[PDB]
């Protein structure tokens, strides 16, 4: 009964970071060695866990979050970071326990002319709390007069398209990111490594 990591990492389509995807991994045997022993990732950072010791560990549940961001934004998917992504799209807690895995996806997510399907929230009055997902498309009021759903002066559409083209500098190319959260509650452990 293997954990369906293949469904998460090898998904034909990833979510936009503002509407990041969460998959609750539970009741399965998890071989994390298929991930660590893979020359496919540019980023593989773990927090509160050793990456090689993951196969010895047992968790209540594991969460697999996934989205697409720029290469220069992958550094914001870590505890204690600021920026448009950490502040208005996907926020990790300071006591984060889990892994952050990223890889270049220029061959899949960039289009000759611009993709436009991948978005990010550009306007938000306040920063997100950790693991908050805001999918509101309400017109952003930058002044004193209400917008009333009409894009215009001091009334912006809150989301912005990435517009990924294969002629972008590496730090501006699309990157697929999978964040694995490790949950440890006073309840039975449903996700254990191979025994």
């Amino acid at each position, epitope marked *: 009964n293997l954990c369906p990591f293949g469904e998460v990492f090898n998904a034909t389509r990833f979510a936009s970071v503002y509407a990041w995807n969460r998959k609750r991994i539970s009741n399965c045997v998890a071989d994390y060695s298929v991930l660590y022993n893979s020359a496919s990732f540019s980023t593989f950072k773990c927090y509160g866990v050793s990456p090689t010791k993951l196969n010895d560990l047992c968790f209540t549940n594991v969460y697999a979050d996934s989205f697409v961001i720029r290469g220069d934004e992958v550094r914001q998917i870590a505890p204690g970071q600021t920026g448009k992504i950490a502040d208005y799209n996907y926020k990790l807690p300071d006591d984060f326990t889990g892994c952050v895995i990223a890889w270049n996806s220029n061959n899949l997510d960039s289009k000759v002319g*611009g993709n436009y399907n991948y978005l990010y929230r550009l306007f938000r009055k306040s920063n997100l709390k950790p693991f908050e997902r805001d999918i509101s498309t309400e017109i952003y009021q930058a002044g004193s007069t209400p917008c009333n759903g009409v894009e215009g002066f001091n009334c912006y559409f809150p989301l912005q398209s990435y517009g990924f083209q294969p002629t972008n500098g590496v730090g501006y190319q699309p990157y697929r990111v999978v964040v694995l959260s490790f949950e440890l509650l006073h309840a039975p452990a449903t996700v254990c490594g191979p025994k």
Partner: antibody
Amino acid sequence: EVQLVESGGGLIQPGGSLRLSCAVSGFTVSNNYMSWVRQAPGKGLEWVSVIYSGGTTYYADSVKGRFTISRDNSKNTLYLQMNSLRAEDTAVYYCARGDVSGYRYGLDYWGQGTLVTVSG
Amino acid sequence: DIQLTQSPSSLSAFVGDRVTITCRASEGISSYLAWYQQKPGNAPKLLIYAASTLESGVPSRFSGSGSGTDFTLTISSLQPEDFATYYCQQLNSYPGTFGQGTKLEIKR
């Protein structure tokens, strides 16, 4: 009628400190990306710093550790605290609405400017 | 870092001339580019944003085109009030580098 009014500039010796203010009307400072841009005499434009509505701040590498952008939501005013001023900091400083990284709108409204002269 | 090369440094023209100002980024910055106009003793004024979107209130004679590395600002019919310095700006990443500028002067 959007209006951005800078003040606080003037003559100061190298090593000194100065605070610029920018009283705004026409948009809410606390709800916008607000930037500081400067122009040395006879030169081009140079972005200095930005504050996000959420609180995040960024600076240009030439002003890091010496300048601090901030605001007062109640007075709809933006500030720039300039410490350890150097001769090169001599420029007209402009406050503008907008950001310069993944912000396609550019800097749509700018103040008249305030001249800061750093000289001994 | 991203370098923007704006050309020419100066351009000579008459009222009624079609003028094109060029801007070349060192890497693909898609449509993250703005165009500003500045007159001596005055703050810059935004003309075009998102590479080709005309800013509200700006006259129709100003237009921008391009995406990636090569951008252009066109002034289809110069008016007396258009003799000024023009700047391109990359809005892709900090520090939002501005171009060196193009002074548009009177032909003689």
